[PDB]
Design a binder for this molecule. Sequence first.
Ligand code: FXJ
Ligand code: FXJ
Lengths: 160, 160
Amino acid sequence: FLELERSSGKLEWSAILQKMASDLGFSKILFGLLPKDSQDYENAFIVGNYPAAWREHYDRAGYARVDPTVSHCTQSVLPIFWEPSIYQTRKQHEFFEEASAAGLVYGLTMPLHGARGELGALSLSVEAENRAEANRFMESVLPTLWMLKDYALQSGAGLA
Amino acid sequence: GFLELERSSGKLEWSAILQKMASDLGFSKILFGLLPKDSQDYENAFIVGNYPAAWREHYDRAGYARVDPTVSHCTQSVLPIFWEPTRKQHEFFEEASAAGLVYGLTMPLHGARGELGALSLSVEAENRAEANRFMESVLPTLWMLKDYALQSGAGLAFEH
Ligand SMILES: COc1ccc(C(=O)Oc2c(Br)cc(Br)cc2CNC(=O)c2ccccc2[N+](=O)[O-])cc1
Ligand SMILES: COc1ccc(C(=O)Oc2c(Br)cc(Br)cc2CNC(=O)c2ccccc2[N+](=O)[O-])cc1
């Protein structure tokens, strides 16, 4: 894990982060961090390899206000898994459908809360054939991801 | 199961459960301390564990919260600090050692609502190399435990 802090700068950190993620089995990741008491996303540090069209669609649709993982992150340090039960309203369900259409079906979101009030999320999606396989996979990797998120937060807050 | 923390009733039961989970991971002495957001003193701290009373009393009376290097580390990072040796810092390590607390680590706690604290755990060992091997062997499980303790503990201390 210390290779993240020991990376040279943004590009090497992003690739190392995305590579640790792929080695664990997640082809898609997004790390997002805001400074303490941020009012909007003008100063957000957001990196990863989510598809561009989905990044753009989520911004244009204002999905930070509907995505249930975002409100979760304001309330907890524990992971939220992407499962049917977290999409309660129709509007959350169609967030779910559009993420799915973009290729992001199975996954989880780890909240980020830094020592200087930084607020963020590390999200990772796994390409699996059904929820049973996705869940099995995530169990096997969860303790390692649990460390990764804090090593990512501490190093990324230093970079950002 | 981490679930038994969230379902406990009252600080006695919670602290017992946490102490047992730690003991199972090889740690005989632990201290969980948590302050509300932007605390200026320790008057509203929630501190539970099985550190010895004489050591707790000494640490407070001697002002060791201003000396102990783990405390400033927690204000600056989410990553753990392993216990490894200023002249007052020299005094601090000697007196901890005299109290039986020689090897261990402190896991900083940064809550979703700005709670600040630490989960400190001591391991009994023949020497530091052996202590290190004992801690490394359980570090992924401890990493999950500290965040479960923080999420449940914040509720117990400040909300329910
Ligand atoms: C206030 O502090 C914050 C808030 C938010 C983010 C943050 O990274 O949010 C974003 C952004 Br910005 C853009 C996209 Br595209 C996606 C997310 C997160 N959601 C999922 O991955 C997700 C979550 C559940 C299901 C599907 C997905 N998905 O996007 O495919 C960071 C810091
Ligand atoms: C940032 O908000 C905070 C700050 C601090 C604590 C916190 O719990 O601090 C305490 C207290 Br209060 C009493 C004692 Br006794 C010990 C500690 C911590 N140090 C060690 O365990 C230690 C650390 C290194 C080596 C040895 C030891 N040891 O005590 O044996 C909680 C919340």
